[PDB]
């Protein structure tokens, strides 16, 4: 029942789309886990969704560890935690230290940002038992994707990428790919919980769908998300 990296690999091979959503609290993590969400992303997006800041840069490693521990008490699903700004780019050794704290806090994988210049860090961590989700995002994108794949990234995440390009990347790398605003050709999808639940007022990002509307329970709204992700309904045009 527990979702592992092998689980994601089998799903990629079988073509079964992976459902990912952000999570920052125990209650919602538990709700999403039981609702079918395979990967829970404790992302630095909490700097805006939870802390109410204008950017994610001020989020600290302590903040990430706190929310990771919270989510871990609630959730079978795999917990992925973001290495926060400034906590891992100094060197691969610093990255390892930070990632280690996140793993000790309950994470099963850590997410880092950067292209080819970060590939050495991906390898350093993966070789030491820390699964890595490499966040990237034409030829530059492919190079970044390959670099991290070669380095052993467990998952490659793309944000705001041409559908056609994402498809090519997904077929080029051996590891599963996850996307947001990158089309349905990716091995899976991810959305910020608060966004797909219509927590924020006014229109929503073009690449985000409100799954709250149409249902009278968050539990149903999430299941609908998972459903459309596997049915390849979402993302649509």
């Amino acid at each position: 029942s527990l979702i592992t990296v092998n689980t994601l690999q089998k799903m990629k091979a079988a073509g079964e789309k992976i459902a990912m959503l952000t999570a920052y609290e125990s209650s919602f993590a538990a709700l999403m886990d039981d609702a079918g969400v395979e990967m829970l992303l404790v992302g630095d997006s909490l700097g805006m969704a939870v802390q109410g800041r204008k950017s994610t840069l001020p989020v600290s490693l302590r903040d990430m560890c706190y929310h990771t521990e919270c989510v871990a008490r609630g959730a079978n699903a795999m917990i992925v935690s973001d290495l926060p700004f400034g906590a891992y780019q100094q060197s691969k050794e610093q990255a390892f230290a930070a990632a280690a704290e996140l793993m000790a806090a309950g994470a099963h994988m850590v997410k880092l940002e950067g292209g080819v210049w970060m590939a050495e860090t991906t390898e350093f961590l993966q070789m030491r038992g820390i699964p890595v989700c490499a966040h990237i995002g034409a030829q530059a994108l492919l190079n970044d994707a390959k670099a991290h794949d070669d380095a052993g990234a467990a998952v490659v995440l793309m944000e705001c990428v041409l559908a056609e390009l994402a498809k090519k990347v997904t077929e080029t790398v051996s590891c599963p790919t996850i996307g947001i605003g990158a089309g349905a050709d990716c091995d899976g999808q991810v959305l910020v919980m608060h966004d797909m639940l219509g927590i924020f007022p006014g229109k929503t990002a073009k690449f985000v769908k409100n799954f709250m509307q149409g249902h009278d329970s968050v539990q149903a709204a999430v299941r609908a998300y998972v459903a459309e992700v596997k049915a390849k309904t979402f993302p649509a045009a």
Copy 2:
């Protein structure tokens, strides 16, 4: 409305002069923002204007983060640039990144560092990791106690530009030289005591408001004198910068 690096690049291409002024308090930052200042420099010059010291060297990273947070609560559209203080970034590019990351977390949109070609590697290290850098060359206050010069300055400018510097700031540079640099580097240039051919200008707020006694420096103009309010003084500065009448 928000001023971004892209905004500055478009201004450089259009020949629209950029107005920068130092800021260390929320109230004045809001006033300058509303008066049209496009870049607010939370500089280590506060070591002298705010702390009353004889030089900027004693300013700490905590001091810079504090004033950056203050300015951030008052700024609206203007871009906030924060100085990496003496001793907090020159040990290594790794130390510089650590210090710069603290400033960005405090509210900065760009950090400024002083030094020539020997600091270019640090500029590259920071920019590649998401931290925009303003490279300060020429007469650098942090080294106040310390033909060929022309080429040396040009090489410093090119090194930082090639390293990815978002902006190059020149202080006390021959007008003719500064013009050549501005026409050579791809990034916008800002000057003080460097002529009006730079892509923009900067002055210490307290200097241009005539807060200090005596005569103002040669490359500084008192904008409070001859104007009816602090707001008007700042608007006058922005207007003369864009009209290319300042510096004269």
Copy 3:
């Protein structure tokens, strides 16, 4: 007193080495008196003592604490302490610092997990007077993360000067080949009886956990009237080469 020299003489003589995990003074004294030659203060305490789902959260402070506890109870047995996750993989210098704290806490040897990429660290520590037990095969610290690789890992640590090589859940035939290939003594768990010694988590072999025993684990409490008798039986079977049996391999 059990020294590295003792272990090497035993490997040469074909006399099997008995190792068991230990996290408390009382049990350590009991196992020492019962003939256990190596006491492993392992990060397995993260599960047996702390009740966690993995060993990753175990800190260096935790390891030093249990090492000090075991040192107050042990007498003749050699104390081996695990370097916990995150405390030694950053660099060989960090590993040395962490291992030094464990030696200061009473350890006589430290255990680290990793393949060829850790051989440089093994060398760095051994040269500085810190005996190293190199753990290869199934490494719990990388649970969230083949045959030739195992051989390469063993050879690399042996060449780097590892005092002992420990293998977990490895096909018997392979374990046998490794043991006959490296110069240092080998210890196994779920690796067959051809290793130079064996190790088991104390709580597992005492039947402390409910449910069926792990495949490579034998309940030594059953059939005996005391914890002392259970431990003595384990030591006896290891030396008699009756454990692990075909069923535990």
Copy 4:
């Protein structure tokens, strides 16, 4: 207001520079008013102020404290602060961190002890805005631990690295003269003859604060005067008139 530029112009004009150690605000103000151009907040305070047998126990905190004290008393004089034993020899990076603390405390220049092996550190600091006074010859920090060519090499190494000043202690006068005529930067001497570009003495030594006879290269300037102000002015006058050091020193 004394700057590095001032010192260079003085070297070129042959005007001897007067330097004296200072550890308190009151004496610093007195020396500044008396014409002393360089105030050395030296680790010699380990003996003159702290009463120790050597300068090795002096800490960076002690140096910053005395530097801050002197900075509240000095007006025109340039403040030079010693990097204390242990605070800068680990690496050029450590030296910079230590030197930066001294500059933050009020120093205008820092002094380090060492030969060619320290030149890389001199360059590192100077390039970063920290003026360096390189101390060669007899270096008190190494008190527990052809030879003329080595001194020349040490001086040239630091000069080439960008040292603002080179200080020589207990060196053959003829040798000190050659060095002074060779390096581009000003030289300051103590027990190195009068041909250096300037002189330095420990305040307490030249004020006769210690019992017994002063060192051979030291002159008691208190004798013959009835005010510290006059004693210091006599030192400045004799240094500039080149009557000190005399043949006897």
Copy 5:
């Protein structure tokens, strides 16, 4: 007068044997200084003699600085040599320097480190920065839990690195003699024969403080005298007369 590195070099040159003993307290340090002991070793052996531990590995840098300060308040002319404790100096030459600097600040005049050729780079690093180094080779207690040409290579490496003194422990006398004759610096031995330039013993061992049989290369100098003062003077005298070790 005061015993300096120069004093030791002159003694080696003249063949005058150097007397060294361990010291961990001010009172005993003063007594040994007055009795003619030329080198006082504030050694990590205090982990066993003072702290009562089974090995010297648990001794900390704080412990070493504390005992060094204590000995420095009692000593007058003798040279104080302080051991860099296990874990405090082997990480890098930079770490060793920081640790050694703390010991010098605490009152040491020289620091001792354990290790062969692999530690010579550290010896050079410290010596160049004004910290005299005593290189301890042979049987090193810090490696207790873990040949002729190896010893010679270790001695040569440290001498070439500028070690002020080379200390040999438990080495064949014939080998120790060759080393002493080949290195430029003075040698001190314990269980290394009498052909070294000097000798050292743990104070507690030579005063017969521990119960049990006397260690092979150790002599009980307390026996036959009724004052610790006389016991120490006897040790110094036998070392000088080359009658100890026998």
